[PDB]
Structures are given as structure tokens and as C-alpha cells.
A paper describes a structure:
We show that SPATA5 and SPATA5L1 associate in a DNA-binding heterohexameric complex together with heterodimeric alpha-helical proteins C1orf109 and CINP. SPATA5 and SPATA5L1 belong to the CDC48 family of type II AAA+ ATPases, which contain two ATPase domains separated by an intervening sequence and an N-terminal region that typically is used to specify protein-protein interactions.
To understand the assembly of 55LCC, we performed single particle cryo-EM analyses of the in vitro reconstituted complex. Subsequent image processing and focused masking of the top and bottom portions of the map improved the quality of these regions and allowed generation of a final composite map with local resolutions of 4.02 Å and 4.52 Å respectively. We could rigid-body fit two copies of C1orf109-CINP facing each other in a diamond-shaped arrangement sitting on the top of the 55LCC composite map, with both CINP molecules directed towards the ATPase pore. We next focused our attention on six unassigned densities located in the top region of the 55LCC map, four adopting a vertical orientation surrounding the C1orf109-CINP dimers and two positioned horizontally underneath C1orf109 alpha 1 (α1), α2 and α3 helices. The overall map resolution in these regions was sufficient to discriminate between the SPATA5 and SPATA5L1 N-terminal domains (NTDs) and permitted positioning of four SPATA5 NTD models in the densities surrounding the C1orf109-CINP protomers and of two SPATA5L1 NTDs underneath each C1orf109 molecule. Guided by partially visible linker loops connecting the SPATA5-SPATA5L1 NTDs to their corresponding ATPase units, we fitted four and two copies of the SPATA5 and SPATA5L1 ATPase domains in the bottom part of the cryo-EM density. Mapping of the cross-link sites in our cryo-EM model indicated that C1orf109-CINP association with the SPATA5-SPATA5L1 heterohexamer predominantly occurs via the N-terminal and ATPase 1 domains of SPATA5, and it is further stabilized by secondary structural elements in SPATA5, SPATA5L1 and C1orf109 as well as via direct contacts between SPATA5 K196 and SPATA5L1 S88.
Residue numbers in the entry:
A (entry chain L): 710 to 892
B (entry chain M): 349 to 874
C (entry chain P): 201 to 449, 454 to 602, 616 to 746
Amino acid sequence: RETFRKARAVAPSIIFFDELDALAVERGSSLGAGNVADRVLAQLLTEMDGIEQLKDVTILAATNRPDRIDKALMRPGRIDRIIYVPLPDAATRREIFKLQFHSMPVSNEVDLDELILQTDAYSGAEIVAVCREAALLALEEDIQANLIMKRHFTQALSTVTPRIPESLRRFYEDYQEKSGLHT
Amino acid sequence: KVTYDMIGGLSSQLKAIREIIELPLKQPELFKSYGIPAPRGVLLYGPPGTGKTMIARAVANEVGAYVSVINGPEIISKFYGETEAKLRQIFAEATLRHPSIIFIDELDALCPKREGAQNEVEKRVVASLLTLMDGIGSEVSEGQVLVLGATNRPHALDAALRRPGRFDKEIEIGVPNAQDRLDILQKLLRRVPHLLTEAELLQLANSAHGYVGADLKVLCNEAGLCALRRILKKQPNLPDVKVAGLVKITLKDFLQAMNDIRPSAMREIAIDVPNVSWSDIGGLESIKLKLEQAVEWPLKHPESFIRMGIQPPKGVLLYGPPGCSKTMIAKALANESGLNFLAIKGPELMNKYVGESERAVRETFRKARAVAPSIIFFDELDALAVERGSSLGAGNVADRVLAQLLTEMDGIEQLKDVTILAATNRPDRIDKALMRPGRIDRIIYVPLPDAATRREIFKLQFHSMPVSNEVDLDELILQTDAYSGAEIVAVCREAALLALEEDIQANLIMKRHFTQALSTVTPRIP
Amino acid sequence: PLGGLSEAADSLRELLRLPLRYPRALTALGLAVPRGVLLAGPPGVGKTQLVRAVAREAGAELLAVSAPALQGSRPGETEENVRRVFQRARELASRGPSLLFLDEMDALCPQRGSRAPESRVVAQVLTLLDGASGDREVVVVGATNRPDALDPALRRPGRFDREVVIGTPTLKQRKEILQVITSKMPISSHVDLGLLAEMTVGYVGADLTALCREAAMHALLHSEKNQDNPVIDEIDFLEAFKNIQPSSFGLMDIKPVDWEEIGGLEDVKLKLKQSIEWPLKFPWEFVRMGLTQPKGVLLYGPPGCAKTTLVRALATSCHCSFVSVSGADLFSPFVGDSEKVLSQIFRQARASTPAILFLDEIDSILGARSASKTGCDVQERVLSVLLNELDGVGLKTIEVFNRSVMIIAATNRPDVLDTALLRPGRLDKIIYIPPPDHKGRLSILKVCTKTMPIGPDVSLENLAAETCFFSGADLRNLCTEAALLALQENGLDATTVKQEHFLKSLKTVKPSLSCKDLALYENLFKKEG
């Protein structure tokens, strides 16, 4: 409530949401816990109602399993434009690699190509963790070495596994196809 | 009018307090010889009526110097100043009466804790008391003014009092014992015409379980009145001129006046050396050996075996199937080695007393330490050591009381010459958290009895039951395997029942008796 | 002397000295030093004696007035007595260090829901202190036992806020104070004071004083010949200790343990080395390496591996200040204090700013959330204050002063704990601790057995083959009991031990580490991520 009050007070502003499905576990499962959940969701609808009052006061949200929400938020008028965030392509992966190398002294045996090749089915931040662990491995090579060796990088690549299967992308795109509006 | 002899027994603490009170007054130079402060605040504690006031008055006789009895609630007047200034007058006189002693009765009323004292007059007068006490430290006052005290409950006291220079000598006085029971009986009856005999008094005292000094006074007085009642009920035209001397007490008076007595014996702590022995149930020699090792050796052998000092463990859990005379063995060892046995049974602990359960635990542990060469005990502790979580309505207390139990036991070093014996028959029930070593480590399994133990127990029964010689023990032995001591003695009881049920005046348990007994019994070994 | 107190003594020395050891015109340069401190703890140990001693060391008037000796019967005389004492303190400030020492403020402060005149008393002394703030050298030391016992309204900033605890009865201080006491007492010459000390767990100094007191007391009682020189024997000392009442009650494990008392899972060992101790070298490591330090790590293994041992070995191999956090240390009968000791130990971590803090068996520390729906509110309060305080962060951006404690936890029922704990940003790493394999079993048996009396007949590898589903403690108790069997049975006074006894002891300790429970544990707490 106070959130929305301040939002109005600072009208040129944007509300944000994340992990909506957390509060969006449907009632009946937890008998004594989902009560505050539905109260909160109801009051949320009660706040957003001032759409006219929301004079160009946009609301951005994002979640992982959009199904788990109630369509009371996905009913037309309030939250209608939808976008699936596509997994990073090769160029995006290379850009992630650039933003990574720009903060660690790396060796010259680097090769962006096969790195991008053996980093599919991964997520960006996960790949950041990969190069991070490869730096850790080089640190294990010597507590005062300078440059990480890409052999150790491949070792890390072997160690890290993509805990995200392509079936998840299949489901993502299926939901995309079988949902309401996108634009 | 009450010499020390008149006080019912407990001569030990009597002499203790005797010297501890007299000698300071006599020669403070002895304390000062070894650089010792003169102990100011003594305090006794125990269940009521026990002799608190009796000790008070009797020392008030024996002193030879001033004593000023001050009953507790009498000073409680909500008029401010009156209480504290009255104390002030008391202490001024205390000064003028330099060789003297001051006592306070029911001191618990004066010092309830801030959680208990819902009046702050209490807190301020406690403050003034502290001021007084510390003020007694005047060098001219030293060795002459002295403080006494007694409560109904040392727990209901306040922490601010046992601080140094204020209250150190916390002497315990509580439930008397067998010899003490007989003693206090004799002391009470010192000046009453009685129709009692020696062995009658012995067995009578034996029948006493929880009584207290003034309570026994009530008892004997009511027996005397019952005897007077019987006398005047024989003939009702007898004025007291012909009855005040002839009346004397037999046992019947005692029994009648006794069955209507609840001698405050609902929740106590009995230092009760039992009557059991190895001879009562033999066999399983290796088990009793390993146990007496684990309990006794850690003072002698791992001392001489610190050589390979792997570890002398403390917590033992030596258990097998139920009904195998376990607790019997516990008491047996406890009395045979010569330690003061205690007991807290799991079931008897199965009470909703939040904290008060743990309170009893703590008090028992403290008594144990007070009688340090000894063995604490638990029977079926899994009653409150249930598998955690399964009981949300009764185990929620169980986890926290077990944690408190920990908090106490965890003095592995406080556990020097003090061991612990829980009990159960399902090792899976026990929680390995209470077995993360350090506290309760060694374990034995006490298996089913054997043919040797079988013939042992049968010898015991035929020694305790008139039996016919034609029933050879070896027949049972050939058919009593895979039995249990409890089951076996039940078998013997049932054979006796058959013998008396066929002929109500029989004197020999014959073969058919044992036969149909076997028919009526079975090795319930599921 | 200040036996067993010199460390807290010198800390308070510097603290209270700052306004007094150094002049005022610098404060007049736009600085307002805190004035008025709290000494909370069981007194008689030296608290009075130490405040005496420090007012001496600096040079100050030991105005050791006992405020409990100022109670009044009618409202108004008390305030005049306080006027007297505080005014004398004011003229002391007019002359020099007005080291007013006023003890037992909590008895002068019955908290809310109490009567009225406490309000007048506390507000009036507040006037005194707030006015004497203008005066030059006004300082007061409220001496009590527990800060909670005092008036809440007397814990504000610019009020009694600088509060310190009496010395915790440590081993070293225990010995110090025993020696200090007997420094005027004619105890027997031969004294294994350390033994008596370690018997006296939780016993504060004053307790030890009293214990020695009754000891020598019965010494003098049951002896009459040498009326002046007592050989106060350790036997009477022991028996008195026995007689004496137990103690009333963040205990760091002084016990050091290396990487030798532990074998198996050396992978997890190197992991702990990775995410904990290399940070020591960090101030230059990530510089030439990039990656930051992961805030929190959570090690989980089946209950029975004694992970606490590994944690303590880590705390050993670093020299870093270490404090432990346990539920038994935590579950005091004061509701609302758990959060408080949490904050306190974290403040201590801040104090010894290089700090490694361990959260053992947190399922015990934090129970279930919504299993018992009638008494689980203060647990969520601890949950909230935790989630708040767990935010130890710094500049840490591209010399550096590495002022950043580290927190590591371990438990056995993570599926019970609150899920928000594992937040990336609070606990950003989790590691698995499987029960040892055949090789780990072999190794841990070898190392646990390196002091038991071994015989030339044993073959550890066979046990290793058959002692599967055995925890560390399982194998340790096993070799223990088997040694016992061998020794007692054959050599009542023995020399050797046989493996037969281990074989027999196998069934005596039923190993219920079912592999199905292993798979359950692993799946549960690997999907716990």
C-alpha cells in the first residue's frame, strides 16, 4: 500500500516485480499460508485499479513459469504485452565474454569460438561462474600466477553442467505460442 | 525448653551449623588466622515444617547469647518506611547486643523475584536488606553480629542474596530417612505413656514413606487420641480423672490415624538405598562385569590404563528385549557397589509441567552432586526421548526438556564419579544426536536369559515357594528356554495359583500344576 | 590485583580514557564524546576492584558510592541524595576526573508497567547527566549484572549506550584469578590449580573465591594443631568444590585440531580451502584474478560425520578469530534474546574484524517454520533479524583494507529451514559431504586408530570392506568398544587387541545408515539449491 502511495507521489516512476509465481501458488494447497497470499494479490489488484490514476505510470514484471500466476493479472487491460527473453545467441555470449575479460587478466590461448560452442544450453551468469571457476583453477595452479590457461577453462567446462534442459525451452516456446497477446 | 536432642535427628547438619555458628563468635581470630572473611549469611532450605522453626527455637535455647526471632509476613505492612526502619531498629539492637544472631522466617515472602514480586516495595526493601548486610561489615561489628535464615523454597529466593558476603552457607535439610524416621519417632515419644514395643516401632517406621517431623507429631498425637476414644467408648461415664493416665497407644491407633494421612510425599527426592542384591537375580555375569567396569574402572583402571587412554566413557546404555529384569539389575549394581541411587522414570515424567519437569531434572542432578559418589538413573527415558517430531502435542516439550537435560549433563567433568543410566528396549528409538560422543557412549545389549539364568531363577522360586520335589527343575529347563525372567516368575506364580486353586489347603506344587501352568503360559517373544 | 580481567580492563581503559586521557578543546572543535558507560555482569569478581584500579591507572577519584544505599521512603529525599552525589561529581569535574561510580542502576530502574516514582528518578538523573554534559569532566559507570535489567529509557544514544560485559570466565582468567585470590591465602604449596579450574566450568571468579573460602574453612575446622599455618590440602579443596552449588552458567572451542584428525573427502577439504582461507591472501589475489569472494557457503552431510570437527580444523588452519554459534548456547529461557546474542556475536566479529563465524546444525538453531503453528513467532523474528544482519558487505571495488567477516553454516535438515536463507547475496555457495567411501572408511579408521593399543593381528581393510553404512563416529565407537572387549576380557591388565572383537562389536552397534536414506538426503538437499 505504501509502495503504491509513494509510486503515485513520484508519478514519473516504474513499479517492478519479480518471481511473481512465489505469491502465485494457488490457494487450497497451504491452508493457513495462502490466506495472506490471496489477501496480498487482491490488494494488489485493488491498487493497480487506478489505471487512469496511473497516468503513464507503467508496471514491469518478469517471472520464470508464467503459467503459475492468476489471470487476474493477465486479464486484458493491466498486463497484456508479453515477451519471452530469448536465450543468448553466439554474439551475446561473446559480449558476455568481453565483459568478463575486461575485469580479469587472461592469457592469450583464449579462443572465443569453441568457448561459445561448448557454452550452449547454459545461461550467461552461469558462464560467468564458469570463467570464474577457471580463474580459481589457475589460482590453484599457483597462488601468485598471472594468466589463466584455457586448458583449465576446458576443465571447468567439463566440471560445469547445464542444469537447464532444452525441454524447458520447448515449454517456454509452447506457452509463447499458446498464450494471449504479445504485441 | 527445646534442647538440640529434642530436634528430630539430622545430627550431622546439627553439629555442622553448631560449630559454624559458635566458633565465629568465640574466636574471630581463627578465621583471621587463615585470612578468612567471617561468614555472615547462613541459610537453610527444605520442604516446610521440616524443623525450620524447630531448629530456630532450639538454637534460640542453646545459644547463650541474644536471638531475635522475626517472623516473615508479620513485618509486611504497606506503610512505607515502617518495614525498613523496623529492620533498622532490629539491627541497632543487634549492635548493642554485639554477641548475638538474627533469624528471618519465611524469607521467601520478602524476596520474590521481579517476575514473581508484583510489588516493588519488595524490591526496595530487598535493596535496604542488602545495604544492611554489607553494612554489618563494621570492624567492631565483626565476629559479633551474625545472620541466620530459612525458607520454604530456595528456588523462590532472589539472586541478589546468595552474592558473596551476603549468603553462602546454603545448607539443605529435607526428607528424613529410615534411621532418621525411627529416631524422630523415639524423640517425639520421649515423654508419652505408650503401649508400644521395639519391633512394633521398627515395622511402623518401615511403613513410613514421606512423613515429616511435625507431621509425625500429628500422627502420634492422633493415635493417642484414638486410644483415648477407644477407652471412653468402652465405658462413657469416665471423667478424665480416671482416664488421663491409663490411656496408651497400640498399633491399631497408629494404623487408624495413619490411613487418613497424606504425608506430603507426592513429589520428593528419596535417597533410598534399596534392598536388592545380585543374589536376588544372578547370571549374565559378563554383562554385570562389563557394566561395573564402565562405571567403576574409570576411577581406578583407566587411571592405571591411561597408558592406552583411548577414552573412559561416561554415558552407558546397556539394553536388550523388555522384561529382562533390567531396572532390577540397575538397582542391583547401584546398591552392591555402594552408591546412593536416584531415579527419574520416563513415564512418571510424562507430565505437562512446562519447565517444572526440567526443574525436577535440575534439582535431582544437584542432589546427586550433593551425594556425589552415586548413580543417577532413568527408566524408559524414550518416554520423553521419543522419536523427535512424531508427537507435535507431546514432543514439542520433549525436545526442549531433552535440551535442558543436556545443558545439565554436559558437565562431562561435573560427571566425575557420577554416571548416568537411561533405559529402553528399542535402540532405533534412541536419537544419535544424544550419542554424538562425549556424553553417552558405551552400549551393551542385554540379551534373553539362558538355561543357566533359568535354573537360577527357578532355584530362587523353589527357595521362595514350597514345591514338590517330584517336579525336577531340568524338565522346566528342557521346556523353559526362550523365556524371560519376568515371564518365568509369572509362570511360577501361576503354578502356585493352580496348586492353591485345586486344593485351597495344599502344600506341594505338583507336576500337573506346572503342566497346566505351561498350558496357561507362553514365550511371548514377538 | 585485577586477576583474570586485564584484557577487558585495558579495553575499557582506552574506551573511557578517550574523553579523559585527552583534553576537551578538541571536542569543542565540534565533537561530543559519549559519556556514561555500563559494566554488566556478576560483581565481586573485581568489577568494583577493576573500576577502582583503572580510575587509579589514569588517576581519578574512586567515588565508589553504593547507589543501593540511597533508597528512600518518601518521594523527594531520594532526588536530593542524588543531587548531593551528582553535585559532588560536578565539583569533581570542576577539579579533574569525576570518575563517578554508581552501581546497581537496574534496582533504581524497574522497567515499564511499574509504578510512577521510577519515572521521576530516571528523568531527574537524566537532567543531571544532560546538564553536566556542559561541565568538563563528568563520567559515570553504571554497575549492574545484565543490561536488560535496566530502564529501557536509559539506553538511548547520548545516554547509557557504551555497555560492556564482565569478563567471561575463561580458563586462562580462571587460573589467573585463582592465583590472585590465594596470593593472600595460605593454601598448600602443591596445587594443581588447573585441575580445580577445569572442574569449575561456568564458575565466575567470585564463585571461585567462595569455593576456596569454604575449602580453607573446613580445613581450619577439621584441623586444630597448626593453628596458624594451614596446609590447605587439595583433598578438602576438592570436597568443598563437590559441595558447592553449580554455576549459574559464544564459547569458542579453545581445542585446536589439525587436518590430521580428519581424513576422507579431501575434495571438500580443498573446497573449504578455496572459498574460505584464500580470501586471507585476497587483498592482492582477486586483483590479478578478478572474481570476488562468495559471501556464504553451506556444507551439508549426513548427521554422523561430525562436520563440526572439519569446521574447527578450518578455524585452526587460519589463525583467524573464531566464535561458535550453537542452539544449546542459543536456547536460553529468555524469549527475544536469541536475536540479541546473534547481533552481539556479529558485533564481536566486527570487533575482531577478520572473523570466521560458524552456524552449526541450523535446523536446531532455526526449527520448523509452520509445523507447530502456535509457538513459532519469535523463531520468525530471529529469521528476520538474521536476514537483515547477514548483509556484511563493503566497498570491494577496483591497496585495500579487508574488513569483511565471513559466515559459514552447516546442518542436517536443510529442507526444514527457511528457503530465503539460500538467497544469492546471502549464501552463494553450497557443498555436499557424502559419508566416506570404502577408501574414506579405510583412511578414517586408520587415523582414528593411531593411538589405540593395536595388535599385530588386525586387518583394517576387511572392516573397511564390511563396515559400510558407517559414520565416522560409528567407526570410532566401534574400535573403542572392541579395544574395551579385548583389554578387559583377555588382558584385565592388557597390552594388545585383536580384530575378532571388532567383528563381534559390529552387530553391537547397529549401523542404520540405510543407503535409501543416503539417496533421500542427497536428492533432497541437492534440489534444495
